[PDB]
C-alpha cells in the first residue's frame, strides 16, 4: 500500500544552477532522486520514486549572462595572493519555489511521517540551497488512477517534469523540436587507482560523464499519468521513469 508525502512551496536559496557545463539552471534528476536516498540513509524511510514541479524558478543573473559570486581565497598556496579579488570559475546559482512528491511505504500512522520528514527538511540542503519557508507535509493514499487523480488536482499550480526522450542526439534535438535537455545518468570511464583522496576510503571510485535526455514542462492539471512524471533509480547508474517516455 503506497504512500505519498508532499513538500509544497519550499523556498530554495543558494542552489547552484550548474547541473553541467552544458545544462545550467535546474539541478538534474540525479539530485532529486538522491534526495530519496538521503532520507533513506539519514532518516531510514525507504523512498522508491520521486517527482517534482516548480512553482517559481529564477537563475541569479541577467538575460544572457548568469554568473558567479566573487570566490574566496580558501586554498593553500596563495599566501601573498590574497589582496587580489579571486580566481573566478563559473558557478551560477538560482532560487526557486518547488513542490516535491515522495513515494514511501510506512506501515504506521501518518502522524510520525510528517514530523520525520519535517526534521529532515531542516537539516538537509536542496542542492546547496537553503530552505526558507515550506508548507506542512501531508500524507496521501492512492490505490488506483482515480485516487491518483486526487494527487493530481492538489498540486495546482505547478509545472511538473516528464520524460521526453532523445531522437538521435542532444543539440540537434534541442534545435528542431525546441525542447529542454537535462542529465539523467552517468557513464563510468576510469577507476582511480588510489583511494587515499576519497571521502569514503572503502568504496571504489570511477570517473563519470553526464548522459542527457529531453524532458517536458507540463501543467499539473493536464498530465494524463503521474507515473509518467515520477522518477527513480535505473540501470546502470542512470535514472528513468515509471511511466516511460511521454
Amino acid at each position: 500500500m503506497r504512500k505519498f508525502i508532499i513538500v509544497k512551496n519550499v523556498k530554495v536559496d543558494g542552489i547552484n544552477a550548474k547541473s553541467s557545463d552544458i545544462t545550467v539552471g535546474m539541478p538534474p534528476a540525479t539530485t532529486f532522486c538522491g534526495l530519496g536516498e538521503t532520507m533513506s540513509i539519514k532518516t531510514g524511510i525507504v523512498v522508491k520514486a520521486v517527482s517534482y514541479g516548480s512553482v517559481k524558478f529564477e537563475v541569479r543573473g541577467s538575460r544572457f549572462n548568469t554568473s558567479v559570486t566573487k570566490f574566496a581565497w580558501q586554498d593553500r598556496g596563495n599566501g601573498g595572493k590574497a589582496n587580489n579579488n579571486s580566481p573566478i570559475q563559473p558557478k551560477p546559482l538560482a532560487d526557486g519555489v518547488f513542490t516535491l512528491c515522495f513515494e514511501v511505504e510506512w506501515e504506521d500512522c501518518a502522524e510520525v511521517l510528517v514530523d520525520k520528514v519535517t526534521n529532515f527538511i531542516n537539516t538537509a540542503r536542496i542542492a546547496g540551497g537553503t530552505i526558507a519557508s515550506f508548507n506542512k507535509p501531508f500524507v496521501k493514499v492512492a490505490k488506483d488512477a482515480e485516487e491518483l487523480a486526487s494527487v493530481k488536482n492538489a498540486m495546482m499550480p505547478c509545472y511538473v517534469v516528464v520524460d521526453c526522450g532523445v531522437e538521435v542526439n542532444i543539440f540537434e534535438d534541442a534545435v528542431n523540436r525546441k525542447l529542454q535537455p537535462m542529465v539523467n545518468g552517468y557513464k563510468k570511464l576510469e577507476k582511480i587507482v588510489d583511494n587515499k583522496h576519497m571521502r569514503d576510503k572503502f568504496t571504489p571510485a570511477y570517473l563519470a560523464t553526464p548522459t542527457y535526455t529531453m524532458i517536458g514542462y507540463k501543467m499539473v492539471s493536464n498530465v494524463d499519468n503521474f507515473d509518467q512524471a515520477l522518477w527513480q533509480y535505473g540501470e546502470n547508474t542512470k535514472v528513468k521513469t515509471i511511466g516511460g517516455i511521454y
Binding site: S20, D21, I22, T30, G34, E37, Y186, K188, L189, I192, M198, R199, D200, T203, P204, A205, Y206, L207, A208, T209, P210, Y233, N236, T237
Partner: peptide, 16 residues
C-alpha cells in the same frame, strides 16, 4: 554517490 545494486558508489562528474 549513486545507488547501485545493494549499495552506493562514489563517482566524480567530469565534463565532456
Amino acid at each position: 554517490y549513486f545507488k547501485n545494486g545493494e549499495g552506493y558508489d562514489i563517482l566524480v562528474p567530469i565534463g565532456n
